[PDB]
Design a protein around this nucleic acid. Sequence first.
RNA 1: GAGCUAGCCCUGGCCAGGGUGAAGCUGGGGUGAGACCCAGUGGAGGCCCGAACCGGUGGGGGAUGCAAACCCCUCGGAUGA
RNA 2: GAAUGCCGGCAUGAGUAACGAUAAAGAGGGUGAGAAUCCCUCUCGCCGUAAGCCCAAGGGUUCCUACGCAAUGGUCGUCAGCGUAGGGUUAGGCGGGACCUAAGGUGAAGCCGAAAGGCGUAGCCGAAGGGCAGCCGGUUAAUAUUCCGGCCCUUCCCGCAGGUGCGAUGGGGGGACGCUCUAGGCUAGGGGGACCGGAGCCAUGGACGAGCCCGGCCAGAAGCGCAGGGUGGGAGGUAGGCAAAUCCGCCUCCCAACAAGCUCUGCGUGGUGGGGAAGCCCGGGUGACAACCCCCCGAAGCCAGGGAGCCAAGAAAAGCCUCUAAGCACAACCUGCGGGAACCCGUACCGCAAACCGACACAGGUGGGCGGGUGCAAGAGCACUCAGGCGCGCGGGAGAACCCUCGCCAAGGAACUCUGCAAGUUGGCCCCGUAACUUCGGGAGAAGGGGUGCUCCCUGGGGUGAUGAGCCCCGGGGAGCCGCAGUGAACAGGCUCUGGCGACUGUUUACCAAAAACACAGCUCUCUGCGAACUCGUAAGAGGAGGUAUAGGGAGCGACGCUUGCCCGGUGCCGGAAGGUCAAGGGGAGGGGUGCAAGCCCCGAACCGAAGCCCCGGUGAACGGCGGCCGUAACUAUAACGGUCCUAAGGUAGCGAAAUUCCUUGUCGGGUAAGUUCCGACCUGCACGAAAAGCGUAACGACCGGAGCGCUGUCUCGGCGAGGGACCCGGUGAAAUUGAACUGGCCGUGAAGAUGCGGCCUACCCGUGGCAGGACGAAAAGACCCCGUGGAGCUUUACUGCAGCC
RNA 3: CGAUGUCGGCUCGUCGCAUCCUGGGGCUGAAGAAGGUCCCAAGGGUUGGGCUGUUCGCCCAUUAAAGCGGCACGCGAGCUG
RNA 4: UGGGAGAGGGUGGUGGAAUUCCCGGAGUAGCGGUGAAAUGCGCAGAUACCGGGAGGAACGCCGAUGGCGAAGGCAGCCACCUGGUCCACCCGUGACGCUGAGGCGCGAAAGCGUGGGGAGCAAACCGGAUUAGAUACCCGGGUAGUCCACGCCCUAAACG
RNA 5: CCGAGGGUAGGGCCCGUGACUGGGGCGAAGUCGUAACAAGGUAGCUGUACCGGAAGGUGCGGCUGGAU
Lengths: 48, 275
Amino acid sequence: MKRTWQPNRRKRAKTHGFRARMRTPGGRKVLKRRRQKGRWRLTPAVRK
Amino acid sequence: AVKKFKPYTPSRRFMTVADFSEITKTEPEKSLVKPLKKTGGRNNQGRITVRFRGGGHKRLYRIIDFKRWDKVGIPAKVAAIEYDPNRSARIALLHYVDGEKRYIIAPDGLQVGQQVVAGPDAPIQVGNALPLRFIPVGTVVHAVELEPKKGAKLARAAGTSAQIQGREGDYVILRLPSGELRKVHGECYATVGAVGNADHKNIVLGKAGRSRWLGRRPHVRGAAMNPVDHPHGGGEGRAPRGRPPASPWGWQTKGLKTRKRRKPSSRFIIARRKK
RNA sequence: GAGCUAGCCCUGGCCAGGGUGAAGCUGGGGUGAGACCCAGUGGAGGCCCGAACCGGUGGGGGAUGCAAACCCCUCGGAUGA
RNA sequence: GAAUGCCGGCAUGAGUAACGAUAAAGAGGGUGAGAAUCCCUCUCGCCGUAAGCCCAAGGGUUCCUACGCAAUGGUCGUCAGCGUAGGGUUAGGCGGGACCUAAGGUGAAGCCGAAAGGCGUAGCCGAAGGGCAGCCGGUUAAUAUUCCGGCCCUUCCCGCAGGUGCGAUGGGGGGACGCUCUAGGCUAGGGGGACCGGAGCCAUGGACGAGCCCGGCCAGAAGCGCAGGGUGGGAGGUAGGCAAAUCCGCCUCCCAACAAGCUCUGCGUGGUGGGGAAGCCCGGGUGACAACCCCCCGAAGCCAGGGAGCCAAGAAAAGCCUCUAAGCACAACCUGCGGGAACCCGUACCGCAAACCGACACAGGUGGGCGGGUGCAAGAGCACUCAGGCGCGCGGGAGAACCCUCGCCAAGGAACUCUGCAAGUUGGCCCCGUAACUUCGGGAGAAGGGGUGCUCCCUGGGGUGAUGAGCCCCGGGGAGCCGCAGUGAACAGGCUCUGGCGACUGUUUACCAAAAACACAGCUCUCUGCGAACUCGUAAGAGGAGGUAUAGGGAGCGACGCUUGCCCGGUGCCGGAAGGUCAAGGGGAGGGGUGCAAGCCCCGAACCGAAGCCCCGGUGAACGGCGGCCGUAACUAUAACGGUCCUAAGGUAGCGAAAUUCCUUGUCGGGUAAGUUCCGACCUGCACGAAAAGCGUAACGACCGGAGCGCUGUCUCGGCGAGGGACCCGGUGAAAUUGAACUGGCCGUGAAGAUGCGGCCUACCCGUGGCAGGACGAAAAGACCCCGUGGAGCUUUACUGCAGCC
RNA sequence: CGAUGUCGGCUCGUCGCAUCCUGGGGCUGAAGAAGGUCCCAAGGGUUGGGCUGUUCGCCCAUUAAAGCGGCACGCGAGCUG
RNA sequence: UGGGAGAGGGUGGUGGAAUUCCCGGAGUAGCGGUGAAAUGCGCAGAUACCGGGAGGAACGCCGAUGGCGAAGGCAGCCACCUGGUCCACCCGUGACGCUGAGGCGCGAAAGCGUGGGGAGCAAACCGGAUUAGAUACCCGGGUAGUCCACGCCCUAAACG
RNA sequence: CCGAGGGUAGGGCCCGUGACUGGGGCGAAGUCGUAACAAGGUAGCUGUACCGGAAGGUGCGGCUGGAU
Ligand SMILES: *[C@H]1C[C@@H](CC(C)C)C[C@H]2CN[C@H](C(=O)N[C@H]3[C@H]4O[C@H](SCC/C=C\[C@H]3C)[C@H](O)[C@@H](O)[C@H]4O)[C@@H]2O1
Ligand SMILES: [K+]
Ligand SMILES: [Mg+2]
Ligand SMILES: [Mg+2]
Ligand SMILES: [Mg+2]
Ligand SMILES: [Mg+2]
Ligand SMILES: [Mg+2]
Ligand SMILES: [Mg+2]
Ligand SMILES: [Mg+2]
Ligand SMILES: [Mg+2]
Ligand SMILES: [Mg+2]
Ligand SMILES: [Mg+2]
Ligand SMILES: [Mg+2]
Ligand SMILES: [Mg+2]
Ligand SMILES: [Mg+2]
Ligand SMILES: [Mg+2]
Ligand SMILES: [Mg+2]
Ligand SMILES: [Mg+2]
Ligand SMILES: [Mg+2]
Ligand SMILES: [Mg+2]
Ligand SMILES: [Mg+2]
Ligand SMILES: [Mg+2]
Ligand SMILES: [Mg+2]
Ligand SMILES: [Mg+2]
Ligand SMILES: [Mg+2]
Ligand SMILES: [Mg+2]
Ligand SMILES: [Mg+2]
Ligand SMILES: [Mg+2]
Ligand SMILES: [Mg+2]
Ligand SMILES: [Mg+2]
Ligand SMILES: [Mg+2]
Ligand SMILES: [Mg+2]
Ligand SMILES: [Mg+2]
Ligand SMILES: [Mg+2]
Ligand SMILES: [Mg+2]
Ligand SMILES: [Mg+2]
Ligand SMILES: [Mg+2]
Ligand SMILES: [Mg+2]
Ligand SMILES: [Mg+2]
Ligand SMILES: [Mg+2]
Ligand SMILES: [Mg+2]
Ligand SMILES: [Mg+2]
Ligand SMILES: [Mg+2]
Ligand SMILES: [Mg+2]
Ligand SMILES: [Mg+2]
Ligand SMILES: [Mg+2]
Ligand SMILES: [Mg+2]
Ligand SMILES: [Mg+2]
Ligand SMILES: [Mg+2]
Ligand SMILES: [Mg+2]
Ligand SMILES: [Mg+2]
Ligand SMILES: [Mg+2]
Ligand SMILES: [Mg+2]
Ligand SMILES: [Mg+2]
Ligand SMILES: [Mg+2]
Ligand SMILES: [Mg+2]
Ligand SMILES: [Mg+2]
Ligand SMILES: [Mg+2]
Ligand SMILES: [Mg+2]
Ligand SMILES: [Mg+2]
Ligand SMILES: [Mg+2]
Ligand SMILES: [Mg+2]
Ligand SMILES: [Mg+2]
Ligand SMILES: [Mg+2]
Ligand SMILES: [Mg+2]
Ligand SMILES: [Mg+2]
Ligand SMILES: [Mg+2]
Ligand SMILES: [Mg+2]
Ligand SMILES: [Mg+2]
Ligand SMILES: [Mg+2]
Ligand SMILES: [Mg+2]
Ligand SMILES: [Mg+2]
Ligand SMILES: [Mg+2]
Ligand SMILES: [Mg+2]
Ligand SMILES: [Mg+2]
Ligand SMILES: [Mg+2]
Ligand SMILES: [Mg+2]
Ligand SMILES: [Mg+2]
Ligand SMILES: [Mg+2]
Ligand SMILES: [Mg+2]
Ligand SMILES: [Mg+2]
Ligand SMILES: [Mg+2]
Ligand SMILES: [Mg+2]
Ligand SMILES: [Mg+2]
Ligand SMILES: [Mg+2]
Ligand SMILES: [Mg+2]
Ligand SMILES: [Mg+2]
Ligand SMILES: [Mg+2]
Ligand SMILES: [Mg+2]
Ligand SMILES: [Mg+2]
Ligand SMILES: [Mg+2]
Ligand SMILES: [Mg+2]
Ligand SMILES: [Mg+2]
Ligand SMILES: [Mg+2]
Ligand SMILES: [Mg+2]
Ligand SMILES: [Mg+2]
Ligand SMILES: [Mg+2]
Ligand SMILES: [Mg+2]
Ligand SMILES: [Mg+2]
Ligand SMILES: [Mg+2]
Ligand SMILES: [Mg+2]
Ligand SMILES: [Mg+2]
Ligand SMILES: [Mg+2]
Ligand SMILES: [Mg+2]
Ligand SMILES: [Mg+2]
Ligand SMILES: [Mg+2]
Ligand SMILES: [Mg+2]
Ligand SMILES: [Mg+2]
Ligand SMILES: [Mg+2]
Ligand SMILES: [Mg+2]
Ligand SMILES: [Mg+2]
Ligand SMILES: [Mg+2]
Ligand SMILES: [Mg+2]
Ligand SMILES: [Mg+2]
Ligand SMILES: [Mg+2]
Ligand SMILES: [Mg+2]
Ligand SMILES: [Mg+2]
Ligand SMILES: [Mg+2]
Ligand SMILES: [Mg+2]
Ligand SMILES: [Mg+2]
Ligand SMILES: [Mg+2]
Ligand SMILES: [Mg+2]
Ligand SMILES: [Mg+2]
Ligand SMILES: [Mg+2]
Ligand SMILES: [Mg+2]
Ligand SMILES: [Mg+2]
Ligand SMILES: [Mg+2]
Ligand SMILES: [Mg+2]
Ligand SMILES: [Mg+2]
Ligand SMILES: [Mg+2]
Ligand SMILES: [Mg+2]
Ligand SMILES: [Mg+2]
Ligand SMILES: [Mg+2]
Ligand SMILES: [Mg+2]
Ligand SMILES: [Mg+2]
Ligand SMILES: [Mg+2]
Ligand SMILES: [Mg+2]
Ligand SMILES: [Mg+2]
Ligand SMILES: [Mg+2]
Ligand SMILES: [Mg+2]
Ligand SMILES: [Mg+2]
Ligand SMILES: [Mg+2]
Ligand SMILES: [Mg+2]
Ligand SMILES: [Mg+2]
Ligand SMILES: [Mg+2]
Ligand SMILES: [Mg+2]
Ligand SMILES: [Mg+2]
Ligand SMILES: [Mg+2]
Ligand SMILES: [Mg+2]
Ligand SMILES: [Mg+2]
Ligand SMILES: [Mg+2]
Ligand SMILES: [Mg+2]
Ligand SMILES: [Mg+2]
Ligand SMILES: [Mg+2]
Ligand SMILES: [Mg+2]
Ligand SMILES: [Mg+2]
Ligand SMILES: [Mg+2]
Ligand SMILES: [Mg+2]
Ligand SMILES: [Mg+2]
Ligand SMILES: [Mg+2]
Ligand SMILES: [Mg+2]
Ligand SMILES: [Mg+2]
Ligand SMILES: [Mg+2]
Ligand SMILES: [Mg+2]
Ligand SMILES: [Mg+2]
Ligand SMILES: [Mg+2]
Ligand SMILES: [Mg+2]
Ligand SMILES: [Mg+2]
Ligand SMILES: [Mg+2]
Ligand SMILES: [Mg+2]
Ligand SMILES: [Mg+2]
Ligand SMILES: [Mg+2]
Ligand SMILES: [Mg+2]
Ligand SMILES: [Mg+2]
Ligand SMILES: [Mg+2]
Ligand SMILES: [Mg+2]
Ligand SMILES: [Mg+2]
Ligand SMILES: [Mg+2]
Ligand SMILES: [Mg+2]
Ligand SMILES: [Mg+2]
Ligand SMILES: [Mg+2]
Ligand SMILES: [Mg+2]
Ligand SMILES: [Mg+2]
Ligand SMILES: [Mg+2]
Ligand SMILES: [Mg+2]
Ligand SMILES: [Mg+2]
Ligand SMILES: [Mg+2]
Ligand SMILES: [Mg+2]
Ligand SMILES: [Mg+2]
Ligand SMILES: [Mg+2]
Ligand SMILES: [Mg+2]
Ligand SMILES: [Mg+2]
Ligand SMILES: [Mg+2]
Ligand SMILES: [Mg+2]
Ligand SMILES: [Mg+2]
Ligand SMILES: [Mg+2]
Ligand SMILES: [Mg+2]
Ligand SMILES: [Mg+2]
Ligand SMILES: [Mg+2]
Ligand SMILES: [Mg+2]
Ligand SMILES: [Mg+2]
Ligand SMILES: [Mg+2]
Ligand SMILES: [Mg+2]
Ligand SMILES: [Mg+2]
Ligand SMILES: [Mg+2]
Ligand SMILES: [Mg+2]
Ligand SMILES: [Mg+2]
Ligand SMILES: [Mg+2]
Ligand SMILES: [Mg+2]
Ligand SMILES: [Mg+2]
Ligand SMILES: [Mg+2]
Ligand SMILES: [Mg+2]
Ligand SMILES: [Mg+2]
Ligand SMILES: [Mg+2]
Ligand SMILES: [Mg+2]
Ligand SMILES: [Mg+2]
Ligand SMILES: [Mg+2]
Ligand SMILES: [Mg+2]
Ligand SMILES: [Mg+2]
Ligand SMILES: [Mg+2]
Ligand SMILES: [Mg+2]
Ligand SMILES: [Mg+2]
Ligand SMILES: [Mg+2]
Ligand SMILES: [Mg+2]
Ligand SMILES: [Mg+2]
Ligand SMILES: [Mg+2]
Ligand SMILES: [Mg+2]
Ligand SMILES: [Mg+2]
Ligand SMILES: [Mg+2]
Ligand SMILES: [Mg+2]
Ligand SMILES: [Mg+2]
Ligand SMILES: [Mg+2]
Ligand SMILES: [Mg+2]
Ligand SMILES: [Mg+2]
Ligand SMILES: [Mg+2]
Ligand SMILES: [Mg+2]
Ligand SMILES: [Mg+2]
Ligand SMILES: [Mg+2]
Ligand SMILES: [Mg+2]
Ligand SMILES: [Mg+2]
Ligand SMILES: [Mg+2]
Ligand SMILES: [Mg+2]
Ligand SMILES: [Mg+2]
Ligand SMILES: [Mg+2]
Ligand SMILES: [Mg+2]
Ligand SMILES: [Mg+2]
Ligand SMILES: [Mg+2]
Ligand SMILES: [Mg+2]
Ligand SMILES: [Mg+2]
Ligand SMILES: [Mg+2]
Ligand SMILES: [Mg+2]
Ligand SMILES: [Mg+2]
Ligand SMILES: [Mg+2]
Ligand SMILES: [Mg+2]
Ligand SMILES: [Mg+2]
């Protein structure tokens, strides 16, 4: 049947992407915590 | 003269539609339309603030002239009468001798080809706009400003009118469409006559799809819901109200008055509505 | 977190074929004039049969499955909310 | 040593289940260490509105080639979407950007919020919408509207020529629009040809033929032809289009007005450029100087912004055209021509799937376009087939039980069962015919029946063409022929009577309930005069609504018909300028502390003093409620009638053993051989009853009762047969579970149901196929029940607060 | 209570005997036939249907008879629901 | 042809009296009602009086034993549209007449549908009296309805 | 071919019968009230409407077949 993951590059970048994270107090904290933890990627990668 | 249908479907049994006999022009004046931004009852928060709205036919908003004191003394000819889906009244297309074109809501009996005009000296003829002070006591009028130069507010729905009961200083006394007795300032403009399309009240929508066409989504009784939803919600089996009948938000909905207490316009209300 | 689901907003798209035959229109009859009747034309409808499409009624299978809801037969809607 | 402990390792079940759609395989020849599994060939089968082809998303090198087979591949592997390497994606015209706006987002101005932030006109962003210039063929192992070939086109810059008041983010026009139905003419596509071109073929009885088989085109600029769309011309006035305006709008006059003209597309033709089959021979070559022609069918596509009808009344902005403003009129703009200029990103491959979403090469899910032929009334349905693509990544045998999917069945025919559950029956089209009731539509496909193939003869109308022929769509009449049977295969209603519920089409518990539930038109009550009520928000701001009482919110009821009675004492709501109570506050009789005192400080009565409450009214489609006992008639029985207690008032009409009736299978009647169900009645209604509506109601229903006809493997009562499994052999090889085990019956015993204790009985050791009585078998720290001064949802006249409102 | 699945049916039985029938008896208010009552006897047998979920029960038509009870109200790792 | 009388009919308009309610004023202890009473209303200021407003319905006098219409029925006043009828003249047609099964149309009141309207009145209904009872007669409330538009109903002591 | 008739299916009219139900006629001395006849103690009747154990009452309009 129709499962729950229906990938969509525009959706992905507009929802979890770098710019959406920056435009918000909580998104900036997300970037801050993932940097402090040393994540290799701070946001999902999408081809664009 | 609302039109009936033979019962060739269960819904065509009772469905009645307006007769459209007074309409003479079937597409609107491109100069005077703009797009009507549908809300679905959602406010700028995105939240439903008026339930059960949405999904009706597409509409273009026809700009209507509710000022009319815009063009005192300039006569206009009534060129067309048209269907307007944003209001119950029909609208008349005016060609002013200026060349300027405008929509008014179409009073009763208004004839295509006659002329109308606005101002302190206009004739007392159906379709003319005078300050309230200059319209004789007894005249049945529509499209009435509530405060001067603020725009026609009262008596705009199909069939409605206000009647001029008397004068008192700078104010006239109107019997509003609801039976209320109110003082409206005499410099307020009003239009001579009652609104047209008075058969509008006798339309029988006839089926449920009709309500959907008009943007009306189905309305759920609070007694069909659960406690988390409604004061009438819950119960094993059917259930009477079991408390004073109440809104989804808990206030009483059989009798409880809700006009603000100390509202300044109270000074200007002679008699609250009737019936 | 509404890329699942629910509702709404914007903009696009889709609905084989067959059936039934509303109003109106025309003509004919009718009458003081009418109502109205008949024929033809017409092609209405949360109209009918039925694919796609959308469903999920009954039964059977499946039950460490092909599948964390599937399969087969049957069945509902299919110009409309 | 135990924590259903944690991490890891390794056992057991077990060579067990399984190896993923039952579309299907066999053989020969190659290759190689090794082949059912890779390559080739022949035979067979499967899809063919796809299981074929082309886009979009998503994926991200999976594409092509060489060399590989440890692992991955449910077997094998020499093969592969796998390993290693190398190669491969070419654009002014395709898509996106340097263009436009949509919701929405963002946001100079501005507004609001302890902070973070929230709003917000313009403007900006935002597309699968608008706008904008490329078609055909060839080439590569792999890209091509991109390279190449042929023929077309767009914009930008500079120039020459001719023309013009040139000039805009400003004005206007236009862009610019719905649903259903639809005309003319075309194209796409398809069918036939006794015509044209072609390698061939004559079999097995016949045919050397008007034979079989194959093919008979595609693109094209100007010009022209056919079919359409768009569009009035001139003049005068002018105060409107937030400056101006010759434009636009408004008024007048004149002419043109089925037209025309101009303009713009579609189709055809068109210089020219391509393509070009079977067959045969080795993707190639030939065929071939290939031929490329006539007739017919014909779109849902094109002309298009076409036409008609309808109500629910159907985006914007730019490009473009026109107007003028600053300005400039040595400029500028328009037309024509010439030369130059033309950037960034995508382009491989998969794409109904082994490459996307489902942990898997997973029977599931995934938007758009093409989707051929024949027959079946039609069609995208169904059967078979073209092109093209496949046989589903374990096989080989056997021919048990049992299971699944399927076929048939003597006599009977629902006797099965909770239930005809299931499976039969019926089944398309044409014709005949068709009941109660009805809201006159319907009920209706009611029911029930007849017809249906093939051949010969005759003949009617519609399309094409010419009016004929020919092709083509519907037929009508007659005479025959064959079979068990003519919708001969495939796809395709079983019917009726009667009741309950709900008017109806719709909606719902994704994944145990589709319903009588929700919704629904319709009815009533109630609130709301607009900065409305109401809703979301601390606010600003929004929605309501660019609406205005024929409107909008809330609530119940639920088409329609006939109706909806009595109670206002309690609760709610509504009205009440009196009275009673009432907070801060006002007032300050009169006290108190301290100081020598002026004073300073504190308590403080009467009295004035809102809402709310009390109190007086009203109000039921507001919350709700609508009696008891006793007696009585000239047979009996029963009480129209009476008496009395009580209430705010004592349940009216209609209905009633009911979706409600406990006693209950009430009693009677019907249906049956027999009826706890059903239907019709009765009424002592445990415990109906009138908008939590009451009683009916045509039509409707995958709802729930009851009956009958038809027909049956449901059954008496089972039999046989098919295939996929099960079974045996080769390959690969799980699982939950498991204290250890050398694990029998009975009668007892035991924590009360013993393989394990006692006594007796029985029993050589180990398996394989089967069945399920036991191992209080597995699974799940019982969901029932209680317990915990555990938790959570929900209620209210429980307590206490809070928002909101007064 | 770290789970002993709970009514009825179906299927398959097996056991007790306080015997429904069939066999053997004594007494009888046993003339015969038929019946009553008790004794012995568990070998075998003990039907088909209507109603209801029913067990049970009532009813129809039969019968030699239409027995009662145990087996976790026998039997859901056997089915049904 | 020339005239006449008439509440004949339809539409529109429009005038004053009266009642009810509302507001202002003034004023106080009752008003109302009956056979008598009581319910009811009134110091929250009623009744009675003055002024202002709103709204609906019916038209006093004239008015009659009157007039008109086929009947049902028709009454302030005004305009318009329209029917019937009578008289005079003796001018025109030349029996063109009478009746009339069916048919069609009209048809008080009440009642029904859909809108509106609602002052007075008033079935139902509530209350107060009366009475043995009093589902009545009397009194206080009161909803349909009575009024308008359209559409039905088609009855009557529709009687002379 | 037609054809008595038989079968199947569905209609129409009539007769008989039916749990129960509706009123109707009738019947020496039943129960409740007293509606009508006198102004019958509320003049009566009337069509309609609603209500009521019952006769009846009441609304609206009509009649005199009403009285003084
Ligand atoms: C039902 C009977 C109750 C008594 C009734 C309610 C009066 C008594 C319990 C006693 N134990 C049984 C039990 O609990 N059984 C459960 C079973 O669950 C499934 S079987 C399907 C569900 C039926 C019953 C459960 C409640 C398991 O597979 C079984 O092993 C057993 O756990 C009685 O139950
Ligand atoms: K329980
Ligand atoms: Mg889904
Ligand atoms: Mg999605
Ligand atoms: Mg999707
Ligand atoms: Mg995307
Ligand atoms: Mg996208
Ligand atoms: Mg997206
Ligand atoms: Mg976001
Ligand atoms: Mg982002
Ligand atoms: Mg911050
Ligand atoms: Mg910060
Ligand atoms: Mg990571
Ligand atoms: Mg790094
Ligand atoms: Mg992130
Ligand atoms: Mg209708
Ligand atoms: Mg009709
Ligand atoms: Mg109109
Ligand atoms: Mg515009
Ligand atoms: Mg809005
Ligand atoms: Mg916004
Ligand atoms: Mg709301
Ligand atoms: Mg809404
Ligand atoms: Mg409106
Ligand atoms: Mg309108
Ligand atoms: Mg004012
Ligand atoms: Mg209405
Ligand atoms: Mg609408
Ligand atoms: Mg509604
Ligand atoms: Mg509802
Ligand atoms: Mg509920
Ligand atoms: Mg509920
Ligand atoms: Mg919630
Ligand atoms: Mg709560
Ligand atoms: Mg609540
Ligand atoms: Mg409740
Ligand atoms: Mg409930
Ligand atoms: Mg209940
Ligand atoms: Mg409920
Ligand atoms: Mg209650
Ligand atoms: Mg409440
Ligand atoms: Mg008011
Ligand atoms: Mg979503
Ligand atoms: Mg469709
Ligand atoms: Mg048909
Ligand atoms: Mg027409
Ligand atoms: Mg339909
Ligand atoms: Mg059909
Ligand atoms: Mg079935
Ligand atoms: Mg299984
Ligand atoms: Mg499952
Ligand atoms: Mg399936
Ligand atoms: Mg199927
Ligand atoms: Mg079906
Ligand atoms: Mg269809
Ligand atoms: Mg259908
Ligand atoms: Mg639609
Ligand atoms: Mg230990
Ligand atoms: Mg464990
Ligand atoms: Mg542990
Ligand atoms: Mg351990
Ligand atoms: Mg562990
Ligand atoms: Mg390790
Ligand atoms: Mg291991
Ligand atoms: Mg071991
Ligand atoms: Mg092993
Ligand atoms: Mg083995
Ligand atoms: Mg085993
Ligand atoms: Mg297995
Ligand atoms: Mg498997
Ligand atoms: Mg299959
Ligand atoms: Mg199969
Ligand atoms: Mg082979
Ligand atoms: Mg091999
Ligand atoms: Mg090998
Ligand atoms: Mg193979
Ligand atoms: Mg091969
Ligand atoms: Mg095909
Ligand atoms: Mg991937
Ligand atoms: Mg390998
Ligand atoms: Mg290696
Ligand atoms: Mg492997
Ligand atoms: Mg696999
Ligand atoms: Mg090799
Ligand atoms: Mg490549
Ligand atoms: Mg190019
Ligand atoms: Mg540039
Ligand atoms: Mg901010
Ligand atoms: Mg954006
Ligand atoms: Mg953009
Ligand atoms: Mg675009
Ligand atoms: Mg382009
Ligand atoms: Mg081109
Ligand atoms: Mg090369
Ligand atoms: Mg337009
Ligand atoms: Mg438009
Ligand atoms: Mg558009
Ligand atoms: Mg429409
Ligand atoms: Mg072409
Ligand atoms: Mg064809
Ligand atoms: Mg031969
Ligand atoms: Mg012109
Ligand atoms: Mg001008
Ligand atoms: Mg070739
Ligand atoms: Mg050659
Ligand atoms: Mg199409
Ligand atoms: Mg078009
Ligand atoms: Mg058009
Ligand atoms: Mg815009
Ligand atoms: Mg200048
Ligand atoms: Mg110059
Ligand atoms: Mg020019
Ligand atoms: Mg650039
Ligand atoms: Mg490419
Ligand atoms: Mg592909
Ligand atoms: Mg699929
Ligand atoms: Mg597809
Ligand atoms: Mg693939
Ligand atoms: Mg596979
Ligand atoms: Mg798959
Ligand atoms: Mg073909
Ligand atoms: Mg067919
Ligand atoms: Mg296979
Ligand atoms: Mg397959
Ligand atoms: Mg074997
Ligand atoms: Mg067969
Ligand atoms: Mg048989
Ligand atoms: Mg039978
Ligand atoms: Mg039979
Ligand atoms: Mg049966
Ligand atoms: Mg059942
Ligand atoms: Mg069939
Ligand atoms: Mg019948
Ligand atoms: Mg019939
Ligand atoms: Mg019937
Ligand atoms: Mg019926
Ligand atoms: Mg009918
Ligand atoms: Mg038939
Ligand atoms: Mg025949
Ligand atoms: Mg044949
Ligand atoms: Mg069918
Ligand atoms: Mg029943
Ligand atoms: Mg329903
Ligand atoms: Mg329902
Ligand atoms: Mg109902
Ligand atoms: Mg109904
Ligand atoms: Mg309904
Ligand atoms: Mg439907
Ligand atoms: Mg469910
Ligand atoms: Mg669920
Ligand atoms: Mg769920
Ligand atoms: Mg679930
Ligand atoms: Mg289910
Ligand atoms: Mg349910
Ligand atoms: Mg359903
Ligand atoms: Mg529901
Ligand atoms: Mg309904
Ligand atoms: Mg209703
Ligand atoms: Mg209403
Ligand atoms: Mg704050
Ligand atoms: Mg707005
Ligand atoms: Mg509303
Ligand atoms: Mg409902
Ligand atoms: Mg009826
Ligand atoms: Mg009360
Ligand atoms: Mg009260
Ligand atoms: Mg009360
Ligand atoms: Mg107070
Ligand atoms: Mg209560
Ligand atoms: Mg109460
Ligand atoms: Mg009643
Ligand atoms: Mg009963
Ligand atoms: Mg009942
Ligand atoms: Mg009950
Ligand atoms: Mg009972
Ligand atoms: Mg019972
Ligand atoms: Mg019984
Ligand atoms: Mg019987
Ligand atoms: Mg019954
Ligand atoms: Mg009884
Ligand atoms: Mg209720
Ligand atoms: Mg109830
Ligand atoms: Mg009923
Ligand atoms: Mg019915
Ligand atoms: Mg249904
Ligand atoms: Mg249903
Ligand atoms: Mg069988
Ligand atoms: Mg077999
Ligand atoms: Mg062997
Ligand atoms: Mg092996
Ligand atoms: Mg392996
Ligand atoms: Mg051991
Ligand atoms: Mg051992
Ligand atoms: Mg052992
Ligand atoms: Mg043993
Ligand atoms: Mg014991
Ligand atoms: Mg033992
Ligand atoms: Mg032992
Ligand atoms: Mg032991
Ligand atoms: Mg031992
Ligand atoms: Mg021992
Ligand atoms: Mg022992
Ligand atoms: Mg022992
Ligand atoms: Mg033994
Ligand atoms: Mg074995
Ligand atoms: Mg075994
Ligand atoms: Mg076992
Ligand atoms: Mg077992
Ligand atoms: Mg066991
Ligand atoms: Mg245990
Ligand atoms: Mg066990
Ligand atoms: Mg479990
Ligand atoms: Mg635990
Ligand atoms: Mg526990
Ligand atoms: Mg548990
Ligand atoms: Mg639970
Ligand atoms: Mg317990
Ligand atoms: Mg406690
Ligand atoms: Mg405790
Ligand atoms: Mg607790
Ligand atoms: Mg709690
Ligand atoms: Mg707080
Ligand atoms: Mg409030
Ligand atoms: Mg337990
Ligand atoms: Mg355990
Ligand atoms: Mg367990
Ligand atoms: Mg059985
Ligand atoms: Mg025996
Ligand atoms: Mg039984
Ligand atoms: Mg039992
Ligand atoms: Mg029983
Ligand atoms: Mg015997
Ligand atoms: Mg027993
Ligand atoms: Mg027991
Ligand atoms: Mg027991
Ligand atoms: Mg059992
Ligand atoms: Mg079970
Ligand atoms: Mg059981
Ligand atoms: Mg078990
Ligand atoms: Mg067991
Ligand atoms: Mg059950
Ligand atoms: Mg007083
Ligand atoms: Mg006083
Ligand atoms: Mg009034
Ligand atoms: Mg003469
Ligand atoms: Mg009448
Ligand atoms: Mg009284
Ligand atoms: Mg007395
Ligand atoms: Mg008379
Ligand atoms: Mg015979
Ligand atoms: Mg009397
Ligand atoms: Mg008397
Ligand atoms: Mg008397
Ligand atoms: Mg009297
Ligand atoms: Mg009375």
